[PDB]
Paper text:
The ClpP protease is found in all kingdoms of life, from bacteria to humans. Here we show that, in contrast to this general architecture, the Clp protease from Mycobacterium smegmatis (Msm) forms an asymmetric hetero-oligomeric complex ClpP1P2, which only associates with its cognate ATPase through the ClpP2 ring. Our structural and functional characterisation of this complex demonstrates that asymmetric docking of the ATPase component is controlled by both the composition of the ClpP1 hydrophobic pocket (Hp) and the presence of a unique C-terminal extension in ClpP1 that guards this Hp. The catalytic residues (Ser-His-Asp), of this complex, are encapsulated within the barrel-shaped proteolytic chamber and access to the chamber is restricted to a narrow entry portal at either end of the complex.
The structure of MsmClpP1 was determined to 2.0 Å resolution and refined to an Rfree value of 21.5%. Similar to other ClpP structures, MsmClpP1 was composed of two heptameric rings stacked back-to-back (the asymmetric unit consisted of one heptamer, the biological tetradecamer is formed from crystallographically related heptamers). The tetradecamer forms a compact barrel-shaped oligomer with approximate dimensions 86 × 102 Å. Compared to these active structures, both MsmClpP1 and MtbClpP1, have shorter handle domains, which lack a structured β-strand region. Hence as has been proposed by Kay and Houry33, these openings could represent an exit portal for the egress of peptides. Therefore, we postulate that this structure of MsmClpP1 represents a post “substrate-cleavage” snapshot of the protease. Another distinctive feature of MsmClpP1, which is absent in many ClpP homologues including MtbClpP124,32, is a short C-terminal extension (CTE) ~12 residues long, which docks into its own Hp. Specifically, the CTE interacts with three tyrosine residues (Y60, Y88 and Y110) within the Hp.
Author numbering:
A (entry chain F), D (entry chain D), I (entry chain D): 11 to 202
B (entry chain G): 11 to 203
C (entry chain E), J (entry chain E): 11 to 124, 130 to 203
E (entry chain C), H (entry chain C): 12 to 124, 127 to 203
F (entry chain A): 11 to 124, 128 to 203
G (entry chain B): 11 to 124, 127 to 203
Write the structure that this text describes.
Amino acid sequence: LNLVDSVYERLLAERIIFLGSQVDDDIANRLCAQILLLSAEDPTKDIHLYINSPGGSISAGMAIYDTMVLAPCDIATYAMGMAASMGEFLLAAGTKGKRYALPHARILMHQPLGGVTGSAADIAIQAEQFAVIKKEMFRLNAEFTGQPIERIEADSDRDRWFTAQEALEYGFVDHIITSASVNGEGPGAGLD
Amino acid sequence: LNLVDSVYERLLAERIIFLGSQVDDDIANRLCAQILLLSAEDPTKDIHLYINSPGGSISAGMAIYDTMVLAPCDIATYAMGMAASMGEFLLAAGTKGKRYALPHARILMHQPLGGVTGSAADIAIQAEQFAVIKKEMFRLNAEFTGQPIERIEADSDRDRWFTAQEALEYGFVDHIITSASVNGEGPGAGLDK
Amino acid sequence: LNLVDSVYERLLAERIIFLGSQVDDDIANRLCAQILLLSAEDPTKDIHLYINSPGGSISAGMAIYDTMVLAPCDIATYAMGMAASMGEFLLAAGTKGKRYALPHARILMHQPLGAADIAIQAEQFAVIKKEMFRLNAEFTGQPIERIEADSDRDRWFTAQEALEYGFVDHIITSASVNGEGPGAGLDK
Amino acid sequence: LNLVDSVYERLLAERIIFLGSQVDDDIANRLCAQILLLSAEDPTKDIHLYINSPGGSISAGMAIYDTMVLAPCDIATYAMGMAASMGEFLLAAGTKGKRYALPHARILMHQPLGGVTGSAADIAIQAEQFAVIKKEMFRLNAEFTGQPIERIEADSDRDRWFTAQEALEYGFVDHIITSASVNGEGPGAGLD
Amino acid sequence: NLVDSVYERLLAERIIFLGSQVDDDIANRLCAQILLLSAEDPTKDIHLYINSPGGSISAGMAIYDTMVLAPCDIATYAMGMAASMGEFLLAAGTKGKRYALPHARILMHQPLGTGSAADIAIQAEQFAVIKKEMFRLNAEFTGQPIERIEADSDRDRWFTAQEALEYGFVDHIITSASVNGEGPGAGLDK
Amino acid sequence: LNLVDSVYERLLAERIIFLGSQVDDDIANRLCAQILLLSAEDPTKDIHLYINSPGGSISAGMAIYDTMVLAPCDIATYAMGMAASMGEFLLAAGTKGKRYALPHARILMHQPLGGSAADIAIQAEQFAVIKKEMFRLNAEFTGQPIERIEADSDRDRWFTAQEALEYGFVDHIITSASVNGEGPGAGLDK
Amino acid sequence: LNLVDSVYERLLAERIIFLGSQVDDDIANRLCAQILLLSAEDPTKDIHLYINSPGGSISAGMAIYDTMVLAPCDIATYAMGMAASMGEFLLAAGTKGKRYALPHARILMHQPLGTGSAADIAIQAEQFAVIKKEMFRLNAEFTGQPIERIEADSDRDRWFTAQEALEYGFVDHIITSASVNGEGPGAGLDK
Amino acid sequence: NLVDSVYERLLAERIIFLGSQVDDDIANRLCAQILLLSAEDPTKDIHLYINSPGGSISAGMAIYDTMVLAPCDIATYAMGMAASMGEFLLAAGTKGKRYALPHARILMHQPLGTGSAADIAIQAEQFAVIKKEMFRLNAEFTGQPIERIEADSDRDRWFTAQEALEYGFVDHIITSASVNGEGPGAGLDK
Amino acid sequence: LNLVDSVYERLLAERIIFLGSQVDDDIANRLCAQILLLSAEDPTKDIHLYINSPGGSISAGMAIYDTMVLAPCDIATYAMGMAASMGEFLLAAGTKGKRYALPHARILMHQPLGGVTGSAADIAIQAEQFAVIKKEMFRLNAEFTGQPIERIEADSDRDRWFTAQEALEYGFVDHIITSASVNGEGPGAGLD
Amino acid sequence: LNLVDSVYERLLAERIIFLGSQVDDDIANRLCAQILLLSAEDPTKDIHLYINSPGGSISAGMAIYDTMVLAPCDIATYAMGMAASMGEFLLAAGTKGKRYALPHARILMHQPLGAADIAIQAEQFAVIKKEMFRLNAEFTGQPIERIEADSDRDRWFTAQEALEYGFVDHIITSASVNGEGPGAGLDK
């Protein structure tokens, strides 16, 4: 009912979801809940996920990713400003053909933190989980982009970043979107 | 009526409940209330319990569990990110045949805090309660999974953890859900109503 | 749901939105969300962006700008009090012909100062700073080196000087309601 | 809404606006927004701006003033208790003929803060702006009251203040209002 | 919250409550409520209940001017304490409609003297002028000579309800609200 | 040093130490340190432990007790105001013959109800062991049977100075310190 | 100095140092500094380390241990109240023959689980595995127990009374009262 | 306090302690101590004990320049962890006088990049220059090729004491300080 | 005194002063006081001012500079890590011949805050002062380095920075010092 | 007993005291106490008051001034950085012939704004404000109406302008140690 929350709620009614912050457990729960709600309201219409996020934990990002896949809806993704670390991952995880960058977007590859510190197991068990989910993240990024997994890993290690044009050529997105199409003849970006 | 609470309330109308935090007395009260509410609203329709929880006390988790059993309707459970300690327990406690993990969910076994320290009784009485409920936690986890109770105990002792496939194999869930089915040909995950 | 937020929400129903403070990530998220919402509600009706802002982060301002371009509808801009630095940029980014200054508005040009190391952040800052210069040159019709030099010395403008330099298309004094002047979002 | 805000919102339905604190950037935004909203709802009916304000920055007051002029409807102003500094200015800026003082209101002239230090610009650039808007504030106060600009500047320098009757003679307001009229005899004060 | 909800519902009965010290925030809140009630119906009385330990002259004078601005009569009720500017606003109610409850206490007082950016000298000039108006208006409300108002105020003279009736602050003591028709309804008989 | 600490430090020079608050781990560390320090400085001179303590944990109290035993010198104890729970235990643990109560001191028996990285089961095992040993030692200090100690502790039995003397917590009541070598010097005759 | 600090500094002059809290990086720095200082002041006189500690990190404990070995002086250790986790380890690491428990001391074994590193959790885990194994090895060496017994007992948080701790090998003797005349251990109080 | 008092007394033994993360405040503190010890006696060694998890390049380079400015030799001792700039300062000790304790760990690392009022571009230019100098000096300290320093640093390569000796960070492992005369005295033999 | 302050006081006994933080009014007072104290103790011996400072206000730096000149003894300066803005200025203001940079010191030119907003005077009056002291700061930097005033102002405008060797060539310091000399061969750095 | 306070105390032994901040009741108490102490220690030796102050309360400054006059010894004053408002007043109140400005010092004239009611406080403020004007006229030799008018517009001075107007007697550049120039408190 405050202004910002009221606007997000009305955007939800247009099937538009915002990832505008660091990906942590709280944000994952919040985004996961919205994807589930939109799916329940209409499982046949696209969800539009706009991303301006400086990064996030692997664990929290993977929960959002699994919910994107769980949703029977297509999920279009839009690099609105920054898409770094798991923000890059979730952008690239959009339904193929419906992944977009705005022209001044910036995509950052990065080894994020695991987010596996929340439970009271020793560091060895946390490191085990981290190794497995990091390798899975590399593998999925390779599938999203079409790049060899060795390319993904080396670029992640050196924190390679991408302009919108470079991200398009690497394969994180399918198009750079400049202005939304409303009369047909191109992407509507959820603006009908 | 803030945005987060508003979305949770609208999910409640779909009979979807979220366990998104460490399980303590306040979260147990919260979850118990939602299960009772949904049962009272319609005792014939499934409840869908989504779990992304890093752990919790035995005492608090046992109150949720008893309320899950009290509810006349089935409770489907979904490992959405992490189901650790009593979060694993409550996931495995779902209606058999309706326990699910998403493909990258993780399940972690753990010997948790008892949650018995809030009493006005001495530590000897608190320890007596702890020993009883810890043993019963192991026994129930063995019944949920089909594992021998001695394996439950040893694996909990060493903080054994599972990928979603491994958790299905061990017995915590019945199925891995990749995409929800809107077609009847499979689990709807509460999204087809 | 306090009074201030209630008034902003009711203004949203008139397709009026406010950039009333320093541009940062929170403000950018809020403003982008409002632009997307107004676009989705009716992609054929103008959005009216009122600006009274002392500046802010290039990165946040650029994200607002890209959302302005994404929107299918025209975005009219109004310099209400101050339009400084990224506030100037977004004023000048309005749909050409629909950029306005109120009579005592002031426009100020400025070069803002800027998980991966400082080198990566500096590289990203360099591209968006260069883009801000290039686009400011395009909005105003001024040579890019004039934008750079004027920005470097914090050159500022009255409404009439801002009109002559090319940040805005017209000065509005009062709104036209019967429909042959700018209605400033107030004639519906 | 709490009680205070609910009463203000109900007064908004009567086209009554309250300026009850110092004029800073936040208050200017809130005031500008209410003026725009009331204009959009009905551009043919007066707005009634009640003023009990101890002062404010020139820059914030000028933003409010330009929005008062932008409004196609008239803005009646009422000095309810204190109208000091930019509070006096906004009182005097009401639609001529519709500027009122309650019998015990006090009007105070003052040369205030510019409110121009929020920018990242050099203090030389801030002072340039301050000199321009200060001079324009004097010129407009002279236009509002009918006093020569030299008298405005001298009286502001010495923080000259006025009772309601003295404010009427000097030219800040057009009438002292004692009780609102219920049948077109005198001013209704927005309570019609 | 509950408190605000009860006050809002009392507003629908044209009852407003001054239950605290009179400062600028309270002045704004009460002024706003009087204007709102006047706009909603300028022909119906407003009922102003007072339990206030005092407040600033400037803030109390803004309320007083709003009471006089309102076209409605304003009945006033001393509900527990009416001290300093609370006494002033009580005695400022529509004559014939000023009431004290049987155990109410009315206290006279001279408040001591600052939100302007002008020097202390200009602030003291204002205080002197409003202080003298306050005395003059208290004299007119009560029928007492201004010299008696000033002398009694400086010594913090206080009054029981019957003493306040005799002095001239209120017109009646109200023990129980009359739904009879025989007597004041205190706003409780709609 | 501030004033309070300077006075305690100067009292340390007279071999006088204070248990003036609840016995927790921090207090046990400070008292243990003071007992070690005095012992090292002169293992042949008495330490004078003044007690005005409302209680404390068994574990912290037992660490102090063990350090009192470790000390080669006698530890005289003085119930200065209250000696409750582990404060009673430590009073009663003073060198036999050198345990004193001031005339209006009060001694209270009590069962604490009970930190580690181990689970509550291991904590309760340790607690059961130290609780039983505390009852056993209280019996030896006082000469009372263990079952009386346990039952009196369970009901929070308390004692005046004279009652405490008779039960066995202290050996003498001290009213005024002796300067002339007559009786106990209370550490004040150096 | 305040009272507490003043008493600790004066104990330092008697070559007595006090481990009365959880072992973390700050405590390790404080204790390492005191050991170096006493060693510099007189490398021929014992240091007496009194321990009432509920646990601590392996990394912090091992830094203290290496400084204990670096010191040319013998380091006598005393279990004063609790000696748990790395507090047990430091007790058992005292100079052999000069490790002591007071009669009501409790000794608890524990695997301390789990980072101020700039390196990722994988590198931190590699380090932890190395120091954990070395901690088990040394504790086996201090006590005479086989490493597998040390590991299994640590895993189940086995605890010991003073008498059980003596029999297991953590300490060499139980002290009741300090001897000032040479008939037994002086506990650093006989100077 | 006690901690500061022990450090001050160690200063009288020409022993300084880097026990935390290297930031500007730590740089100022350590630089000041090296200058003070140099002024007090420019012919006697300084003993720098290191237990540090890392720190900023700029702050570590200021310390390094002060170590080189000092006319005294500076012996360095890896006491628990020497990571990132802590490794750098360890390896920067006077050659032949760099020591690791047997369970010390040495970690290589590239710190990421801001106190100036200049833009991020000028701050990144500075970081690039100091980062390259850090690699070059690590190569000279260790005898390793600069390419190996950069490659090992980016993967956070870490070392046991024996591995660090072989790689070239330190000259000796010290197990026990020698007051013999046969071996290093670690500053403990004055 | 805590440890840090005790070491600084002992360095004061060696006539060594530390400027290790931003130059504000408090730091200027502390620095001025130490310079006056060392002058009074022995006006014939050098003071050694070690500098590791990220910047500061013009007004505060000018107070320190005037006190450096007031001191009858010489003030040697040493760039220990960073000497930025008024930190560069005070470094360059050392007694000519006795200005030193350590090999990895960095010198940064910058046009800083005036520090003239503490007064109760009008912003116009503050800007007048700022213009005068800024111009004098450029003129003195030109005098210290031997560079023309136009180059000082242009380089300050672009935040030009310098390695120790570049700072030596430009004129901020007279020598790079690597190790202090113990026998009158080279500079003793106050460690003599 | 931190470093900063240790240095000030040691300066006190050179009879040097600092007015380095805004003048308020706390600063006035501290400065009066130092003047009384230095006077009691040796009433024949100069006190050296260094001033770097942006102004403050008339009442607190006047109490410092009265203590300056009470002191039997001369008080030399030094404008070290800023001497504004009551800082200017106390600079100009120094023993005539022993008032000094450092070369880049700035002097600013200013009219500060101001248990008993506001009327009593305003009356007290009026007398000390009038006294500040009268004494400033006496210190400088300027007409009282010039002090008032110049104070009213925040007139400010460089060191040389301050010397010409009469706030100080000399500009000191560097201290004279062998004894035929001002020693600034540094020659003992």
